[PDB]
C-alpha cells in the first residue's frame, strides 16, 4: 500500500517520501526529517496553503501517491 509523497521546499527542492496513507502527519514528518537531516519540530507542512496537523492521517488530508506538499522551516 506504499504511496510516494512529494515535498516541495522554498528553494525549489523536491523530496519524495515513501510512506502509507494511514500514517499520521506527525509520523510522516519523522520519516521526512530523517531523510532530509532536520527534526519534526523544526518544520511545517502545508497542502495547498493549509497547514497539516500532526494527529491526522495523510489519507484524511487526501494525501495520495504523487500528492505535493509544501515544506517550511521555522
Amino acid at each position: 500500500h506504499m504511496i510516494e509523497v512529494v515535498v516541495n521546499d522554498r528553494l525549489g527542492k523536491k523530496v519524495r517520501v515513501k510512506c502509507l496513507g494511514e500514517d499520521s502527519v506527525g509520523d510522516f514528518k519523522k520519516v521526512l526529517s530523517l531523510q532530509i537531516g532536520t527534526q519534526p519540530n523544526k518544520i511545517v507542512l502545508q497542502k495547498g496553503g493549509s497547514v497539516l496537523k500532526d494527529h491526522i492521517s495523510l489519507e484524511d488530508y487526501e494525501v495520495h501517491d504523487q500528492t505535493n506538499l509544501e515544506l517550511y522551516y521555522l
Binding site: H1, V17, K18, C19, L20, D23, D27, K30, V31, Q35
Partner: peptide, 18 residues
C-alpha cells in the same frame, strides 16, 4: 530514497514497515 532504506528509518522510529 529506496524502499529498504525508508523501512530502516521506519523501523528505528518504531513504525510498521511498508
Amino acid at each position: 530514497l529506496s524502499i529498504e532504506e525508508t523501512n530502516e528509518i521506519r523501523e528505528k522510529l518504531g513504525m510498521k514497515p511498508i
